[PDB]
Amino acid sequence: SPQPLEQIKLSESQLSGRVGMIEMDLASGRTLTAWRADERFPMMSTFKVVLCGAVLARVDAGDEQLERKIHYRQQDLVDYSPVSEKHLADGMTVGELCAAAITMSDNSAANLLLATVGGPAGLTAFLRQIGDNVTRLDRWETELNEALPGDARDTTTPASMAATLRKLLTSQRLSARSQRQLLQWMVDDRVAGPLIRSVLPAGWFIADKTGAGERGARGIVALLGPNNKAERIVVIYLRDTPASMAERNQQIAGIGAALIEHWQR
Ligand SMILES: OC[C@H]1O[C@H](O[C@H]2[C@H](O)[C@@H](O)[C@H](OCCCCCCC3CCCCC3)O[C@@H]2CO)[C@H](O)[C@@H](O)[C@@H]1O
Ligand SMILES: *[B]([O])([O])[C][N]C(=O)[C]([N]C(=O)N1[C]=[C]N([C][C])C(=O)C1=O)C1=[C][C]=C([O])[C]=[C]1
């Protein structure tokens, strides 16, 4: 593989779109490498991890329980809700909703959870409260995927998303059990996790959340490292490319391959 930045440049040239990337140590926040890390990209479903961080903060505060069962209606559903559409009769617990949102990218589960944290504005307030002054959620699923050029709605930057994920996972802002729960949901991703894991070299830890939207928008937030350790956060976003989904997946994979082969100490 080429060096990471060289691969990224190739990807931008081939996609005619922007790539945003950061690789950051989970424990300390040391930035290893970065590209357009301060530029805005649509979060798409990667926001679902931050959402469930906010849910866990409410649990820690005694304002929520992962056990609490929410009964909802067919009228509440939006598209791409493979788990929540199966539970109109019996409902889902708050914990099950977060598992569905993170591991199956379930959109209605995410919207139900979003309401519990005060909607997009409430989630944005939570972000400000943990010192993220950049990331913003403005809309619900699925409109938040629109990815209009010039539109700051529903965007983050690679640097802010990585810093925020680090804060949620390790900064002791969340309780120990909450930190462990958030990581486990990412470990359990079913959308891309198993596929990624199958093509990673032996020994590499993976946990992730992916996203996809309009105008080529595609992304992944991941924990990755050799020796079966969640050593680093890797964030890769793509935007404003007319490329096929297959090519977008392959370009992210190629960037990943370069990062893995040229992993610095
Ligand atoms: O010499 C280093 C390694 O080179 C190859 O590994 C390849 C692998 O065969 C390929 O399948 C993967 O694709 C990378 C696909 C990863 C999935 C996307 C990455 C995501 C998730 C993680 C962070 C964000 C991006 O690259 C590595 C590095 O070349 C060899 O197969 C392996 O034996 C060797 O240990
Ligand atoms: B997550 O990445 O936020 C889940 N992604 C989606 O649900 C994607 N959906 C859309 O991008 N999408 C855009 C606009 N609206 C019009 C109101 C939609 O209908 C809509 O669902 C998504 C992306 C790629 C896919 O193959 C499926 C869904």
Swiss-Prot record:
A beta-lactam binds at K48, S105, E141. The keyword GTP-binding does not apply. GO terms for biological process: beta-lactam antibiotic catabolic process; response to antibiotic. Keywords: Antibiotic resistance, Disulfide bond, Hydrolase, Plasmid, Signal. Changing Y80 to M/S: Reduces resistance to ampicillin about 8-fold in DH10B E.coli strain. Changing Y80 to G/K/N/V: Reduces resistance to ampicillin about 30-fold in DH10B E.coli strain. Induction: Increased expression in clinical isolate strain 15571, in concert with reduced expression of a 45-kDa outer membrane protein, confers increased resistance to ceftazidime. PANTHER family: BETA-LACTAMASE (PTHR35333), BETA-LACTAMASE-TYPE TRANSPEPTIDASE FOLD CONTAINING PROTEIN (PTHR35333:SF3). Broad-spectrum beta-lactamase which confers resistance to penicillins, as well as first- and third-generation cephalosporins. Has nitrocefin-hydrolyzing activity. Inactive against the cephalosporins, cefotaxime and cefoxitin, and the carbapenem, meropenem. The class A beta-lactamase family has a specific amino-acid numbering system, sometimes called Ambler or ABL numbering and often misspelt as Amber. A multiple sequence alignment was used to derive a consensus sequence and then the consensus was numbered taking into account insertions and deletions. This allows use of identical numbers, e.g. for active site residues, despite differences in protein length. UniProt always uses natural numbering of residues, hence there appear to be differences in numbering between this entry and some papers. This is Beta-lactamase SHV-1. The gene is bla.
